[PDB]
Amino acid sequence: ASIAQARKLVEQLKMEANIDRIKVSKAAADLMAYCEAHAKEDPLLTPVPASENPFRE
Template sequence: MSNSSALIIAQKAVKQLRMEASVPRMKVSQAAAELKTFCLQNANKDPLLTGVPSSDNPFRPPKSCVLL
């Protein structure tokens, strides 16, 4: 690897690191509190918590037919 290509690679790495350093950060405690609030506000819409009505469930067991 020549010196010029090593220099280009190093410049790209520095550029990437500067970009990553400029990303705005949030405290974990704040992010966790916001996530908890979001989950509690949307819990009534979550089918894993509330269940799916049998009329809307495409995976419901088939009904058996009885002929008399």
């Protein structure tokens, strides 16, 4: 009765199985390269008191 719907998944399935799902060892290092370089500015993991902060009185 309805046969196009079964096609619709495959066209989504076909073009997705070949995408650049990068290697997990390489996947980490891209995400790993964030925090330690992103250091001086964050008041939420290694903070400092509230002089230049947005939320003091």
